Amino acid sequence: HCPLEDIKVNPWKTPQSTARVITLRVEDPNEINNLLSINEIDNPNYILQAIMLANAFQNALVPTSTDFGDALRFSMPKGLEIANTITPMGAVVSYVDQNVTQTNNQVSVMINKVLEVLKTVLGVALSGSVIDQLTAAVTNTFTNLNTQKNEAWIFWGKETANQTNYTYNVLFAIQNAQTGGVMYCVPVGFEIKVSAVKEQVLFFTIQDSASYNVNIQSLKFAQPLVSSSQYPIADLTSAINGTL
Amino acid sequence: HCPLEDIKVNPWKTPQSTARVITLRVEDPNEINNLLSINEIDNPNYILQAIMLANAFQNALVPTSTDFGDALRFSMPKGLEIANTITPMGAVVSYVDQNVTQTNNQVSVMINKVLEVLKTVLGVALSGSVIDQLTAAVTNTFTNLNTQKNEAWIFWGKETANQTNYTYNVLFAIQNAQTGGVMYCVPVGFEIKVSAVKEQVLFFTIQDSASYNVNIQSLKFAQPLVSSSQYPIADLTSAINGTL
Ligand code: NA
Ligand code: NA
């Protein structure tokens, strides 16, 4: 049943990941959290830590101006404020408040522009360790919005016949070989104006074309690792509920 | 600053969810898990339970036939077998092994056909409580494949000039008001033949058109709830690593 061939090693062929992906949708949390929590972890003993950082940066969400609409977005300035109050004491490594704009380009181009900004915040090493989740997360900021439209991290502002305003709040927690003894926390507040009506925006794909004016606010926060292996699960449950 | 208007109550306007969403990507788990774990929970004390069910149904994954390609898929038959060995003892409520086919239709139609099958497995009540995650999950089975292409739950089979074969493995754990004293576990193994080359499949959207022959294998498993609030986090870490 079929002679065994000598190995032809293709060094560019990407091997299948061994990473385990678990998504939690927690109905009716005690306290509301309006940040999509995306966690890239190699040691589950740092999950609680990751969740607590998301709990902290919920307080850095601010309302948009009335002209934009009735929405919440992560504020870099308020983020810095909040950062200094977090225990255990960490360090703000970087922060950005930058506008991004394109005219009559594919949504895929916009995604790339935003990725560029976030990769600058993360850095090469950090970027590389989370590239799949980061790419997905940014993709899901501009597309796949129908299933997300009523979720806690996205807010619809003013909706004209030519334009849709909406905010999108995502937080990345990273702990792996590229981070060492700290966990990086990167909250992102998107303020997005797009040149389509909401009904079209809801079904936008990477192929669609549109003009965007987008403000990106983010910081990168390094907190020394604290394992939670010895605490009861009740404490994790509490962290998730935001009551810890 | 602007007279307060009497309330105009629109009873169809869907309110924003309060649900908290947390995604974990666990790099280098001790034991490999090839099921995308999607958890709809109202009490985080049942997370460990949810993860342990995913650990169990990893053993119900079987290789496809050589004609299809080198892929793993959840097997309903092997699932039933595995079900009977799970402790604490639960009950197989339903199971399906059904082919789904369409000709020259939009991908959105295929998604709807698959949703129909999975909703039949779940039932009205259960379906309704997880509709967003279920819709997203099925959408992500047929689209958004580029960021997923190297992940642990998707396997690429034979790839011709006219057809692409791939498997997709997703597990839903549900615990809320619609489940009561049990948690429902619904693993799904997709075996998908699509009439496009891989390069196109990778960037398929809901708008694209294609022909599909798809086999869906799933069961619905009810396990009585066991809270884990009093165990150490180490046990959750262990469950995630599949060493518990
Ligand atoms: Na939906
Ligand atoms: Na990618």
Side-chain angles (χ1 to χ4, degrees):
Chain A
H1 181 118
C2 191
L4 208 57
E5 244 155 46
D6 290 334
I7 293 159
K8 310 185 294 164
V9 39
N10 178 335
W12 297 290
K13 255 274 168 169
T14 311
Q16 193 187 26
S17 171
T18 58
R20 182 172 192 181
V21 171
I22 296 152
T23 296
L24 308 169
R25 187 164 188 276
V26 185
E27 294 174 6
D28 288 301
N30 292 345
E31 307 282 19
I32 295 165
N33 196 287
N34 303 107
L35 289 155
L36 177 57
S37 185
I38 305 180
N39 306 275
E40 185 77 47
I41 267 70
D42 82 17
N43 185 347
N45 287 333
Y46 301 124
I47 290 170
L48 185 152
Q49 176 164 15
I51 294 170
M52 286 306 295
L53 285 174
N55 288 2
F57 281 117
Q58 169 68 27
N59 295 290
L61 295 205
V62 302
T64 53
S65 71
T66 71
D67 49 302
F68 181 92
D70 182 20
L72 282 172
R73 60 90 49 83
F74 175 85
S75 168
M76 186 255 288
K78 195 170 191 174
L80 296 184
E81 271 185 282
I82 294 300
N84 289 20
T85 83
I86 289 167
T87 80
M89 256 203 63
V92 172
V93 176
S94 58
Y95 46 81
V96 73
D97 180 3
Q98 194 197 316
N99 291 350
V100 179
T101 175
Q102 72 163 37
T103 304
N104 312 133
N105 267 122
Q106 294 188 283
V107 170
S108 64
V109 174
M110 230 338 270
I111 287 158
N112 271 328
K113 280 200 171 201
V114 167
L115 271 175
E116 274 295 329
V117 175
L118 293 184
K119 285 197 285 191
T120 305
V121 169
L122 276 169
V124 163
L126 216 52
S127 283
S129 58
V130 74
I131 194 56
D132 292 311
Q133 281 207 114
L134 178 66
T135 307
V138 173
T139 302
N140 296 336
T141 299
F142 299 97
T143 72
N144 298 303
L145 291 168
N146 186 42
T147 54
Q148 302 185 71
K149 66 185 175 291
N150 294 313
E151 290 296 81
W153 58 86
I154 180 169
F155 299 83
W156 302 98
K158 295 276 178 193
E159 177 206 320
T160 66
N162 295 343
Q163 185 179 300
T164 303
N165 303 346
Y166 75 95
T167 66
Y168 196 104
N169 300 285
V170 63
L171 187 154
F172 302 98
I174 307 154
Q175 170 284 312
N176 56 27
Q178 304 291 356
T179 70
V182 307
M183 160 176 294
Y184 287 94
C185 179
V186 181
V188 192
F190 292 101
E191 187 183 12
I192 300 156
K193 301 184 174 194
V194 55
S195 65
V197 287
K198 194 192 184 177
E199 288 304 315
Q200 283 174 49
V201 172
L202 282 188
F203 285 74
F204 259 19
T205 78
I206 55 172
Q207 291 304 311
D208 286 302
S209 299
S211 303
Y212 283 95
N213 288 325
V214 177
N215 174 254
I216 307 170
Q217 292 185 33
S218 184
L219 62 74
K220 178 205 214 162
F221 185 75
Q223 187 179 57
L225 284 178
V226 167
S227 165
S228 77
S229 61
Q230 283 188 274
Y231 317 154
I233 280 163
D235 280 6
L236 182 53
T237 290
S238 199
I240 289 166
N241 278 298
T243 59
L244 183 65
Chain B
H1 181 118
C2 191
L4 208 57
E5 244 155 46
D6 290 334
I7 293 159
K8 310 185 294 164
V9 39
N10 178 335
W12 297 290
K13 255 274 168 169
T14 311
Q16 193 187 26
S17 171
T18 58
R20 182 172 192 181
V21 171
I22 296 152
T23 296
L24 308 169
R25 187 164 188 276
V26 185
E27 294 174 6
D28 288 301
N30 292 345
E31 307 282 19
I32 295 165
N33 196 287
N34 303 107
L35 289 155
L36 177 57
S37 185
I38 305 180
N39 306 275
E40 185 77 47
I41 267 70
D42 82 17
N43 185 347
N45 287 333
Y46 301 124
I47 290 170
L48 185 152
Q49 176 164 15
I51 294 170
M52 286 306 295
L53 285 174
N55 288 2
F57 281 117
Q58 169 68 27
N59 295 290
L61 295 205
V62 302
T64 53
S65 71
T66 71
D67 49 302
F68 181 92
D70 182 20
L72 282 172
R73 60 90 49 83
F74 175 85
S75 168
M76 186 255 288
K78 195 170 191 174
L80 296 184
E81 271 185 282
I82 294 300
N84 289 20
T85 83
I86 289 167
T87 80
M89 256 203 63
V92 172
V93 176
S94 58
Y95 46 81
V96 73
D97 180 3
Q98 194 197 316
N99 291 350
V100 179
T101 175
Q102 72 163 37
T103 304
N104 312 133
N105 267 122
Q106 294 188 283
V107 170
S108 64
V109 174
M110 230 338 270
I111 287 158
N112 271 328
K113 280 200 171 201
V114 167
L115 271 175
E116 274 295 329
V117 175
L118 293 184
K119 285 197 285 191
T120 305
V121 169
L122 276 169
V124 163
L126 216 52
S127 283
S129 58
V130 74
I131 194 56
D132 292 311
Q133 281 207 114
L134 178 66
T135 307
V138 173
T139 302
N140 296 336
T141 299
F142 299 97
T143 72
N144 298 303
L145 291 168
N146 186 42
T147 54
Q148 302 185 71
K149 66 185 175 291
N150 294 313
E151 290 296 81
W153 58 86
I154 180 169
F155 299 83
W156 302 98
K158 295 276 178 193
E159 177 206 320
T160 66
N162 295 343
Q163 185 179 300
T164 303
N165 303 346
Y166 75 95
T167 66
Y168 196 104
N169 300 285
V170 63
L171 187 154
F172 302 98
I174 307 154
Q175 170 284 312
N176 56 27
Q178 304 291 356
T179 70
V182 307
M183 160 176 294
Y184 287 94
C185 179
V186 181
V188 192
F190 292 101
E191 187 183 12
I192 300 156
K193 301 184 174 194
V194 55
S195 65
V197 287
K198 194 192 184 177
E199 288 304 315
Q200 283 174 49
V201 172
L202 282 188
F203 285 74
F204 259 19
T205 78
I206 55 172
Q207 291 304 311
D208 286 302
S209 299
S211 303
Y212 283 95
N213 288 325
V214 177
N215 174 254
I216 307 170
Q217 292 185 33
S218 184
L219 62 74
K220 178 205 214 162
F221 185 75
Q223 187 179 57
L225 284 178
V226 167
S227 165
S228 77
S229 61
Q230 283 188 274
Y231 317 154
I233 280 163
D235 280 6
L236 182 53
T237 290
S238 199
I240 289 166
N241 278 298
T243 59
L244 183 65

